């Protein structure tokens, strides 16, 4: 055992909930939830509380790193006399091993708690489990699906801790469990802690530089503690005389997300005469290099949804948008050449400049609305889902149509609509005899009739006309089709 | 011409199985004395050297010394498609061309004539085994295999230390260590279990575990493995056959300390 060898972050860790600086409301809500979990379990979790918290069995912790998520989750379980079961990224987590190891500890009792203390009546929940799943983001080895399935068939407090909530892999956690958001604390919460540390270590700290220390490391208090500890070995006076070097040498190089990268590259402040030397082009290309999978899509999605501020004299908004789109097309050509054969990966920075930097710089200004999510990822999936159905229909009709999968969609389907659907509108339920004698000719079925109607666009929209015909003819057509043999 | 008729069929299969997955390309030299071969590993660390005289062959006829290079994968493919009850004959024409492996049953007429196209391996015939070794020893193959495959689970390096009437195998890894110390002793009732040792200077040197695990695969041929060790010399692991011998020349791993 030793007291000095500690890492300055475990000797000063909060040992009680009244020491967690910042986000009082979130930790208070979580404490009330963990306290009323038993009362909500008595009502089978089917009665929402004052804040609507008793209807959720599992808790979710998300926020920027280094704020006290794990610390709060440990202290709230230690204060109520519970027992702490903690699984983390180092342990192997998969649907098999998760259903093997912790599934049995989901509805069982504690074996070590029974020997802890039972002579005095402290609390009735000193024999139960609180399973803390930490760092849910890292599931490189049933990472999110099985854990989300644990949120419904649970019988013990289930606290989950992650870093970023809106990531697509952890979407199932959306409405199956309660979630709370921990924010970056201000400079007023950690100031008392930092001054008390400075008092207990015989080294000066001006109360005026702590705000800059919190600003250079956005929301990681542990980073501030490590910064102070590393510098307090040779310099014991940290004031406004050397704060610039500290703030410049200890910056945080966080990775930017599709929303933030677009918001940054679309800001008209960098491409000005002053900002061009404070945020150089090398940094702009590194911004793309942080995520080369979504940045071009984001830029193509929201390059014309902003109000520029770098418009050259004479050049309007439409011309700038046109040049941005031309460079977008060129970057698309470069990207296709990159991801084609020969695996030309040395052409990446040219794509970074053509697809992202140039169209952004051309329409750089102040964004009017919000950063919209890219739409091409969903449109391509829809196009593929429709192409599958078109190929199926074409290979069903190949015996008689004698036309490619392209010439059928552009030409045949307009007349097939008149032949198939129109008799059901103008003639009613007595045209059921005619329509069938059509589809048996082209080997169609009910599934093909369901798909053919969905292709038409423009004035002819069938997804609304289908709801207009009576339901009795709908129920009779399927029966007539299933009854007769081909 | 070259005609080599074996007495059995599985003999050549068991002979090749010693260094099946250890070397890829070999080159058999056939002379009036017998078949010799030497082949270097892919990483140029160990060398397999095989010598089989005219004792294991039922019939042998070779006029002039011939060299026949071939890969071991296709050779093993050809030996696998032959039944172990036939008689094997290696046939080579006047000039070195595709070698003819012929399987002929002893009861029913089954002529299985396979061809194997030769590779053009540079004839850098090597001359080792004339170097005076500092220490020589011999011990049963089962004990060596057990010791080496028990020590291989603790590390990737194995230090062999021959000291005054003591043999020491030391494995030092991450999870732990292990030391097997044996002493020379000879029994009269079981002359095959005796461990023999003749030393001139104490010798301590390291080897890798993968190469030892690949070498001990040859323990299916004989039962008494010989080990010759010497400073600044490749370690010699010899298996004695009924007609010749199969020897592995392993390179020792130097120590930075």
């Amino acid at each position: 055992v030793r007291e000095e060898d500690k890492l300055w972050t475990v000797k000063y860790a909060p040992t009680n909930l009244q020491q967690v600086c910042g986000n009082k409301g979130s930790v208070m809500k979580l404490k009330n939830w963990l306290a009323n979990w038993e009362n909500s379990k008595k009502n089978s979790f089917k009665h929402a509380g004052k804040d609507g918290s008793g209807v959720f069995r599992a808790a979710m912790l998300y926020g920027p790193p280094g704020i006290g998520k794990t610390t709060a989750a440990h202290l709230v379980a230690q204060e109520l006399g519970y027992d702490i079961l903690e699984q983390n990224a180092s342990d192997v987590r998969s649907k098999t091993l998760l259903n093997a190891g912790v599934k049995n500890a989901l509805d069982n009792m504690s074996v070590v708690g029974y020997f802890k203390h039972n002579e005095e009546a402290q609390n009735l929940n000193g024999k139960h489990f609180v399973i803390i799943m930490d760092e849910v983001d890292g599931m490189s080895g049933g990472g999110v699906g099985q854990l989300a399935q644990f949120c419904r068939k649970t019988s013990t407090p289930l606290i989950l801790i992650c870093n970023e909530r809106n990531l697509p892999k952890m979407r199932p956690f959306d409405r199956v469990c309660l979630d709370i958001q921990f924010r970056r604390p201000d400079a007023n919460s950690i100031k008392s802690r930092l001054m008390t540390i400075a008092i207990r270590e015989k080294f000066k700290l001006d109360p005026n530089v702590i705000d800059r220390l919190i600003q250079t490391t956005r929301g990681d208090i542990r980073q501030v503690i490590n910064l102070l500890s590393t510098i307090s070995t040779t310099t014991k006076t940290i004031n406004h005389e050397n704060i610039n070097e500290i703030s410049k040498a200890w910056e945080k190089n966080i990775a930017l997300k599709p929303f933030d990268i677009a918001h940054k590259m679309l800001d008209g402040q960098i491409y000005s005469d002053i900002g061009s030397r404070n945020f150089t082009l090398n940094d702009k290309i590194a911004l793309y290099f942080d995520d080369f999978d979504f940045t071009p899509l984001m830029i193509q999605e929201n390059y014309l949804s902003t109000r520029p501020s770098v418009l050259k004299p004479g050049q309007s908004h439409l011309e700038a948008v046109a040049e941005a789109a031309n460079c977008i097309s060129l970057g698309d050509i470069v990207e296709k050449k990159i991801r084609s054969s020969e695996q030309l990966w040395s052409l990446l920075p040219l794509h970074a400049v053509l697809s992202s930097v140039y169209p952004a710089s051309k329409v750089a200004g102040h964004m009017a609305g919000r950063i919209n999510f890219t739409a091409w990822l969903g449109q391509n999936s829809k196009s593929a889902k429709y192409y599958r159905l078109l190929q199926e229909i074409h290979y069903h009709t190949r015996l008689g149509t004698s036309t490619d999968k392209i010439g059928l969609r552009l030409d045949y389907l307009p007349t097939f609509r008149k032949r198939l659907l129109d008799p059901f509108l103008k003639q009613g339920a007595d045209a059921i005899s005619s329509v069938i004698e059509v589809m048996d000719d082209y080997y169609l079925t009910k599934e093909d009739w369901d798909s053919i109607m969905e292709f038409f666009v423009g004035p002819d929209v069938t997804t609304a006309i289908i709801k207009k015909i009576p339901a009795t003819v709908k129920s009779g057509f399927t029966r007539k089709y299933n009854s007769m043999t081909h | 011409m070259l005609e080599a008729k074996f007495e059995e069929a599985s003999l050549f299969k068991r002979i090749i199985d010693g260094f099946k997955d250890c070397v890829q390309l070999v080159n058999f030299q056939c002379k009036e004395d017998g078949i010799i071969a030497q082949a270097v590993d892919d990483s140029r660390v160990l060398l397999v050297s095989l010598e089989i005289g005219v004792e294991a062959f039922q019939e042998y006829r070779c006029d002039h010394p011939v060299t026949l290079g071939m890969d071991l994968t296709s050779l093993s493919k050809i030996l696998r498609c032959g039944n172990n009850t036939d008689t094997l004959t290696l046939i080579a024409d006047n000039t070195p061309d595709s070698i003819i492996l012929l399987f002929e049953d002893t009861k029913k007429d089954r002529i299985a004539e396979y061809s194997l196209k030769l590779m053009d391996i540079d004839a850098d015939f090597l001359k080792i085994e004339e170097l005076q070794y500092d220490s020589t020893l011999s011990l049963p193959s089962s004990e060596f295999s057990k010791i080496v495959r028990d020590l291989s689970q603790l590390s990737d390096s194995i230090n062999i230390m021959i000291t005054k009437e003591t043999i020491k195998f030391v494995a030092d890894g991450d999870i732990g260590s292990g030391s097997v110390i044996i002493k020379p002793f000879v029994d009269m009732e079981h002359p095959e279990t005796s461990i023999k040792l003749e030393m001139d200077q104490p010798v301590d040197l390291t080897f890798g575990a993968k190469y030892l695990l690949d070498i001990i695969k040859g323990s299916s041929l004989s039962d008494r493995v010989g080990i010759r060790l010497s400073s600044e010399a490749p370690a010699l692991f010899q298996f004695d056959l009924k007609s010749g011998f199969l020897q592995f020349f392993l390179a020792p791993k130097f120590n930075d300390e």
Partner: protein
């Protein structure tokens, strides 16, 4: 059957020792002094294709160890797999053990390491320096951008300059000594200018013009034979075509171009290069002329690289030259 005379001239005249490597004197001298003093750091040869890198390193490996170089020297060319799983096992085991035959430092020749993945080079970055007092690495490359900066820094950079005229002339004389043959001085100058530094193209076209003699023992290889063997345009009709394009009208210029390019079966891709090389010497009294003259010609060359047409591109070259030679007036 098999003998030294059956090999092509590209390999038959391979330099055995370092003394038969002309041109790169300032690198061969340093390498010989390295091996003489006893110290030989990690080398990195970087040069254009066909300069002498592989020959130099093979001669060095022969000089260091002996006449049997491919015995204790490892060589990983582009023909073997060089993934991360290879640099982990094979190269490390070769660099962590001693030799089998003698007592010396081991040599590892990574030929054409520009074709290695970034992970393989990053893995090699530490094993190249962990075992230094036992093994030495030699990295041969043609494109110095495929290598990561770390691996590029750990090795001593030796650039192989293209062979100057004197070196190729000495090699031509040495080849003409061993092979009964005679070669004209103007033919020698044309061959030097066509070489473009490539020592392999020299020997190739030399074997070609020797084969096209019908008696390679008495008749001398004139410039016409060399120009015919490779089909390259002679400077004479090249300058004639350039003059007819610059001075004459459209009809007669197109006629003389189609007559010159059909008299010997020339190619437009070579005519463009020849005209560019001849016309780079002119003193244009403006900057806007050369800009268009280069841009349009490069576009036409890139289009020829795809083989669209054959006469439309020729008239395009004519039009580009004529329109570029108009801002002068």
């Amino acid at each position: 059957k098999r003998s030294k005379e059956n090999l092509p001239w590209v390999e038959k005249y391979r330099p055995e020792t370092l003394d038969e490597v002309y041109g790169q004197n300032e690198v061969i001298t340093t390498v010989r002094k390295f091996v003489d003093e006893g110290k030989l750091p990690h080398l990195l040869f970087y040069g254009p294709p066909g300069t002498g890198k592989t020959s130099t390193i093979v001669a060095l490996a022969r000089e260091i160890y002996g006449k049997n170089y491919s015995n204790m020297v490892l060589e990983l060319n582009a023909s073997d797999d060089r993934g991360i799983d290879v640099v982990r096992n094979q190269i490390k085991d070769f660099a962590s053990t001693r030799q089998i035959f003698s007592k010396g430092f081991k040599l590892i020749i990574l030929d054409e390491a520009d074709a290695m993945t970034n992970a393989a080079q990053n893995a090699l970055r530490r094993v190249i320096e962990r075992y230094t007092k036992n093994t030495r690495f030699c990295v041969l490359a043609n494109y110095a951008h495929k290598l990561t900066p770390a691996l590029l820094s750990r090795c001593t950079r030796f650039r192989f300059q293209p062979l100057p005229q004197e070196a190729i002339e000495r090699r031509i004389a040495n080849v003409l000594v061993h092979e009964k043959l005679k070669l004209s001085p103007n033919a020698e100058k044309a061959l030097i200018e066509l070489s473009n530094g490539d020592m392999r193209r020299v020997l190739n076209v030399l074997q070609s013009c020797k084969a096209t003699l019908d008696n390679p023992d008495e008749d001398e290889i004139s410039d016409d034979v060399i120009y015919e063997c490779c089909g390259a345009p002679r400077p004479s009709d090249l300058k004639a075509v350039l003059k007819s394009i610059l001075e004459d009208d459209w009809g007669t210029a197109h006629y003389t171009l189609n007559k010159v390019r059909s008299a010997k079966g020339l190619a437009l891709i070579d005519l463009i290069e020849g005209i560019v090389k001849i016309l780079e010497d002119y003193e244009l009294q403006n900057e806007e002329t050369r800009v268009h003259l280069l841009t349009k010609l490069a576009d036409i060359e890139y289009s020829i690289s795809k083989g669209g047409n054959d006469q439309i591109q020729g008239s395009a070259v004519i039009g580009a030259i004529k329109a570029s030679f108009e801002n002068e007036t």
